[PDB]
RNA sequence: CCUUGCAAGCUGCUUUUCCAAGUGUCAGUAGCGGAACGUUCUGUCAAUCGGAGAAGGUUUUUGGUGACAAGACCUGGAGAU
RNA sequence: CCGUUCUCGUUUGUACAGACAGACUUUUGGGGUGCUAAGAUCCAAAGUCGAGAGGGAAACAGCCCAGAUCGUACGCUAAGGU
RNA sequence: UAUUCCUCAAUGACCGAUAGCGUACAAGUACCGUGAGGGAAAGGUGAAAAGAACCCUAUGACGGGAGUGCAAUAGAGAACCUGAGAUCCGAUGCGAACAAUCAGUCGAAGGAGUAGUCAAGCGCACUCACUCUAACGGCGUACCUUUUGCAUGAUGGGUCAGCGAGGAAAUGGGAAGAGCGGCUUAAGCCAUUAGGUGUAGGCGCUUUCCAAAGGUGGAAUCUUCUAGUUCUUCCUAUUUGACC
């Protein structure tokens, strides 16, 4: 038994459940109309999921608003505070600038990159080096915490 | 030890111990009976009788017993009333045999419903023979020649 | 044991080495089997091997009734339970008990009759 | 003996065919010393059964079946009772209703489950004692008789997997196959049912090395 | 009767404790008076519970007046004492008939 | 319930009720009915039996079961009423002795 | 109670008062009387060490 | 089944079992949840059983809470898991 | 605000429902309509049936008593009886 | 890249004679229809025909013997392996023409057939022995469906055997279990006695208000906490014929 893999013995953790078969005896506790009741047009199975009885459904009742804008661009935030995490674990070298392809480099950004970056200031106590940066936005705090410990 | 000892004389029996083969316990039939209270069965028994009780926990087979609630003594000539119990009567037995009895199918269903149900049941019981009644006197031997 | 005399003559423990479903009566017979046998001298206690069938126990008794107990995928404990079983029965036929007081004289004083006096 | 399961390298011998000594061979522990899992073995053998299955089961509905779209006799009116075709799911030589068709059975695992299930079933391997290591696979010869040999002179084995690291020679090739008992794979065909299948597990230096290679290696992504 | 068990042996006067004992079925009984029979602690007819004499007891009681029997410790206790007294062994009766 | 198993409950039925499947089960079904029924039911019809006989045999001597009983119970004489009921068949002059005391216990009204 | 006895197709029996059904309620009487004595000695005060 | 103890492992120093008590609970349609039995087929299985008679069929007996299981005689004549 | 219950039956997240045909009894002494009719009909407040076996009401969905885990040829009671 | 009137080779947790093609058998036949068209049923002696010479009784051997054969109810002439049930005719035991009712159930007189055990004297009383029957007593108005409610004089079923309805895919809402710690690949590619690869994509990290532009300091101070994702099983939903 010491390290035996027999396919004789072998199983998962927990018992494997099984389905749910109804339609058969009294004992199973779903024969008989299995688990639909009398009648209607639930147990026929002829209803559509979301119908509401013939009143104004609420999906018809709220007024639309607005347009969507298909040239909307998106951008990647980033707070500094990640940004002091990174340059202190020697991810990223802070005497450098520090471009997107750094912060894609490092997994500061996501997968997808969609227009750019725009830089936060999330953790912005936590910079305490003059760094410099460049990105596609930035906010007005992360720029007045970068600029006042001597970045840009 | 004690405590299973103190049950067994709350249910009405006392363990005596096994049964040696050089004993002669199953002596031809005396005309006296008793009365005696195992559980809260009651049965009315002279000496070669076989009574089921409800399960004996505290012996085994071919333990001797004294059967400690013993309600009325009888004979040709006297009856002897215990209020409740006769603590001056002794009855002897024997334990036979624990087993099950046949089993019984309990069914239930209710027409028109849907709902039925079929379980069995087996009843543990245990065999006493009853070998000697003691406190009232059993009739001479009359040698008739 | 019916007047003294015990009734279970043979325990028969019937068993495979290879079957999965003896597991239960190889641990028995390792484990419980011993301590029955010290414990019952009065009685024989055989074990047969029977490859590729399930396991059982089966009591032959003085009345020449056997009965056969299929003890498969059980535990030990259950199939010990199952021996203890064997061995506290009188062989009698599995029906139904008539009456739970067995007497050949049922009147000390003589049954009633209208003939009777007081 | 020991406690498997501690990723501790292990030192094995090395022989070959000719039961020979060939030195020692260090076993890397994060791939023959990993905890041995019978869930996860489960999980993989099951994937790669349901991803065997072949799936050409097929039965016919009532579109299938040959037969009229008549309706057989009038609704009303003839004292039975009212069918649409004679060909329904509970008339003899009718449609099967909820009948199998051909599909596939394959389900997904993910790839480290996989790897997973590979390092537990060589940990299992090494630690009954069951793995052999050759410094090679080379016969002199095609002929089954060397392998056979070599099948008797072993101990205690059934069934015996021999593992090849790259391609598999043609005389090991020729003289194996009518063996039921010795199966053969390269390294890249390495799997968890066939080892499972065999209670001897026999591997080549070269196979060894690219198994660990490739554990070593992580998934590119 | 039943009743006739718990007919008081002993005069009835304040006590520091009560007992209830429920005497009377559930079903066709109001929801209210079931719970608050639930809330004294009985559930199972010929069930008895012990309370201290205080005014939020003695208005539970109130309500369901007509389903229990209540009785001081005095009264339990005296009929616990007279039921033991009942069973307790006497000394045997010996009859001979004989000669008929 | 098995169809092998209603054959063996159906044994000595009458009829196609023995036989046929469709009639059988509903006749072992309503037996097994009236077997759990009788159950509790043997209780009652036992204990009607006893108290028959045991007030047969103590109005034999004058005096009726109800006293009978109640004077047994005054005494703490606690022999139930099967066993009484024995008494009364089998073992007539203890019975009378009994009649006796439970008379001289509680003779009643009248 | 139903009170409904001489109308309709559904019979409802009328219950007679008979002696022993007075011997019932005089026994519910006498429990509920002594349920009401115990109440009255027992209302004065209340239960100290609470 | 639950609760409260008890004693064991754990890792969790707290979640799981064994045992003991329980004047604790256990009618049930629609319906919801939990735990199982059996059938066919596949791996385990070039293994195991089979003229020392397989499957299937009739009797009979024994076991489990149950679906069901199992022993033996007879029939059967090559398969069963 | 304070007792009793020691039960979470409370609130709420997530997932799965079924059901939206009810019936009778409580002085016609909670009332409306009807004829101070209906085994009518429509509301209020209880209970039972529905989905509830057992004892009583001759027989009995809905009244009275009372809630069926199993076994016993043990005991005490309810309604109702002798 | 599509398709199969076709050929060759191979495979199947595909079916196994009411299944699988309508057809395992001379089937698009027989049969039905004016016609278009509709459309079956029916497999199995035995290893080998050794397929039963001859006798007896019948008009006549399929019978009773004999013989063949492992076996003859293995004895057939589009059918004989096994040989269930409904159903029909008999044999034995008990009940049965003075007593009524879902045909039982709980008790039970009697009748009939049949075993074994053994201390003491080779009988006899023990195993409530066992099996079948059941005079007589108490209790007992089928089942299913549908209903406020059915013994209902509401529905359905003559009986038996076989068959007969919650099922598959993809995509969502969840639960349980697991892998990894950012997770996971899709088509494809290289191999298959078998896996390995493949980053395009997807979700998360991620920033909350807002139609859009615009805008965006989490919690904590005492070595700081600061994210999920992919599978498997099951319950449900959507689109599909969607329980029949
Ligand atoms: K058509
Ligand atoms: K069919
Ligand atoms: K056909
Ligand atoms: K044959
Ligand atoms: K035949
Ligand atoms: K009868
Ligand atoms: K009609
Ligand atoms: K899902
Ligand atoms: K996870
Ligand atoms: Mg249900
Ligand atoms: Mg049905
Ligand atoms: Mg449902
Ligand atoms: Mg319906
Ligand atoms: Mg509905
Ligand atoms: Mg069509
Ligand atoms: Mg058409
Ligand atoms: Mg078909
Ligand atoms: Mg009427
Ligand atoms: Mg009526
Ligand atoms: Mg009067
Ligand atoms: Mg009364
Ligand atoms: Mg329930
Ligand atoms: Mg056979
Ligand atoms: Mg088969
Ligand atoms: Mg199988
Ligand atoms: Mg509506
Ligand atoms: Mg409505
Ligand atoms: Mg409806
Ligand atoms: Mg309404
Ligand atoms: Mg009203
Ligand atoms: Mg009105
Ligand atoms: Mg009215
Ligand atoms: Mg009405
Ligand atoms: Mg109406
Ligand atoms: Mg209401
Ligand atoms: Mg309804
Ligand atoms: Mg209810
Ligand atoms: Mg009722
Ligand atoms: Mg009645
Ligand atoms: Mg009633
Ligand atoms: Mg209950
Ligand atoms: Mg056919
Ligand atoms: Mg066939
Ligand atoms: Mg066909
Ligand atoms: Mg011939
Ligand atoms: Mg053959
Ligand atoms: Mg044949
Ligand atoms: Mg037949
Ligand atoms: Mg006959
Ligand atoms: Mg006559
Ligand atoms: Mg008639
Ligand atoms: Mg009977
Ligand atoms: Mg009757
Ligand atoms: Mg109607
Ligand atoms: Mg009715
Ligand atoms: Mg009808
Ligand atoms: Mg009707
Ligand atoms: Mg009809
Ligand atoms: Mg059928
Ligand atoms: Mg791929």
New interface residues.
């Given amino acids: 038994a010491?390290?035996?893999?027999?396919?004789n013995?072998?199983?998962?953790?927990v018992p494997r459940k099984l389905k749910t078969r109804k339609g058969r005896g009294?004992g199973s506790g779903k024969?008989?109309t299995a688990g639909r009741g009398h009648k209607g047009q639930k147990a026929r199975g002829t209803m559509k999921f979301g119908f509401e009885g013939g009143q104004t459904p609420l999906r018809r009742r709220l007024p639309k608003r607005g347009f969507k804008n298909k040239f909307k661009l998106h951008f990647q935030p980033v707070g500094l505070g990640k940004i002091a995490k990174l340059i202190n674990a020697g991810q990223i070298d802070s005497h450098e600038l520090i471009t997107m392809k750094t912060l894609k480099d490092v997994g500061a950004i996501g997968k997808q990159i969609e227009d750019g970056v725009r830089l936060m200031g999330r953790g912005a106590d936590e910079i305490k080096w003059p760094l410099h940066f460049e990105v596609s936005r930035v906010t007005v705090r992360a720029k007045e915490v970068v600029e006042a410990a001597g970045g840009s | 030890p004690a405590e299973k000892v103190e049950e067994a004389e709350e249910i009405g029996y006392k363990v005596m111990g096994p049964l040696k083969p050089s004993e002669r316990l199953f002596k031809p039939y005396e005309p006296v009976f008793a009365i005696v209270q195992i559980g809260s069965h009651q049965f009315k028994v002279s000496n070669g009788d076989s009574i089921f009780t409800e399960k004996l926990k505290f012996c085994d087979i071919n333990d001797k017993l004294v059967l400690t609630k013993v309600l009325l003594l009888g004979s040709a000539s006297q009856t002897i009333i215990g209020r409740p119990i006769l603590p001056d009567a002794t009855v002897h037995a024997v334990v036979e045999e624990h087993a099950l009895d046949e089993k019984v199918l309990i069914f239930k269903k209710k027409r028109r419903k849907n709902y039925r149900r079929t379980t069995g049941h087996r009843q543990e019981l245990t065999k006493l023979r009853i070998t000697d009644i003691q406190g009232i006197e059993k009739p001479e031997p009359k040698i008739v020649h | 044991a019916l007047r003294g005399v015990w009734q279970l003559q043979k325990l028969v423990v019937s068993y495979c080495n290879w079957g999965g479903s003896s597991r239960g009566i190889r641990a028995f017979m390792e484990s419980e089997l011993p301590a029955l046998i010290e414990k019952n001298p009065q009685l024989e206690v055989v074990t047969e091997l029977s490859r590729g069938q399930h396991p059982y126990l089966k009591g032959i008794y003085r009345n020449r009734n056997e009965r056969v107990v299929c003890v498969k995928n059980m535990d030990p404990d259950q199939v010990l339970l199952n021996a203890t079983r064997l061995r506290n029965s009188l062989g009698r036929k599995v029906v139904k008990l008539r009456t739970r007081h067995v007497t050949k004289h049922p009147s000390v004083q003589g049954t009633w009759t209208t003939a009777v006096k007081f | 003996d020991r406690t498997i399961g501690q990723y501790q390298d292990l030192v094995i011998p090395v022989t070959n065919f000719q039961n020979e000594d060939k030195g020692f061979m260090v076993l890397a522990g994060d791939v023959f010393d990993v905890p041995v899992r019978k869930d996860i073995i489960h999980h993989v053998v099951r994937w790669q059964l349901a991803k065997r299955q072949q799936g050409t089961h097929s039965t016919k509905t009532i579109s299938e079946v040959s037969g009229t779209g008549r309706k057989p006799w009038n609704q009303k009116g003839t004292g039975r009772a009212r069918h649409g075709t004679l060909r329904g799911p509970q008339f003899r030589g009718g449609c099967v209703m909820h009948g199998p068709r051909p599909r596939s059975h394959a389900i997904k695992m993910n790839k480290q489950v996989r790897r997973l299930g590979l390092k537990i079933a060589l940990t299992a391997r090494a630690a009954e004692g069951k793995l052999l290591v050759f410094d090679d696979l080379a016969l002199p010869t095609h002929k089954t008789k060397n392998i056979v040999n070599y099948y008797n002179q072993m101990e205690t084995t059934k069934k015996v997997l021999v593992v090849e690291g790259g391609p598999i020679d043609e005389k090991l090739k020729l003289a194996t196959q009518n063996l039921h008992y010795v199966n053969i794979l390269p390294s890249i065909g390495l799997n968890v049912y066939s080892i499972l299948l065999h209670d001897t597990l026999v591997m080549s230096r070269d196979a060894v090395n690219k198994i660990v290679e490739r554990m070593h290696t992580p998934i590119n992504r | 009767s039943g009743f006739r068990a718990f007919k008081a042996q002993v005069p009835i006067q304040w006590s520091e404790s009560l007992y209830i004992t429920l005497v009377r079925g559930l079903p066709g009984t109001r929801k209210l008076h079931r719970r608050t029979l639930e809330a004294m602690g009985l559930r199972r007819c010929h069930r008895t519970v012990l309370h201290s004499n205080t005014s939020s007891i003695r208005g539970m009681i109130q309500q369901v007046k007509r389903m229990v029997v209540v009785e001081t410790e005095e009264m339990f206790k005296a009929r616990k004492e007279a039921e033991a007294n009942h069973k307790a062994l006497r000394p045997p009766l010996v009859v001979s008939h004989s000669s008929p | 319930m098995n169809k092998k198993e209603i054959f063996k409950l159906a044994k000595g039925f009458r009829g196609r009720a023995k036989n046929c499947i469709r009639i059988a089960r509903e006749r072992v079904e309503k037996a097994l009915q009236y077997s759990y029924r009788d159950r509790r039911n043997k209780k009652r019809e036992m204990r009607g039996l006893w108290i028959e006989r045991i007030n047969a045999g103590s109005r034999q001597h004058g005096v009726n079961y109800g006293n009978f009983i109640h004077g047994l119970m005054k005494e703490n004489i606690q022999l139930n009423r099967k066993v009484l009921s024995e008494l009364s068949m089998h073992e007539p002059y203890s019975f009378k002795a009994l009649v006796d005391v439970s008379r001289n216990s509680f003779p009643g009204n009248k | 109670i139903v009170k409904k006895h001489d109308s309709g197709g559904l019979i409802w029996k009328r219950i007679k008062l008979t002696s022993t059904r007075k011997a019932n309620a005089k026994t519910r009487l006498r429990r509920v009387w002594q349920n009401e004595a115990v109440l009255k000695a027992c209302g004065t005060s209340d239960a100290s060490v609470s």
């Fill in positions: 010491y390290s035996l893999l027999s396919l013995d072998l199983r998962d953790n009294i024969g008989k």
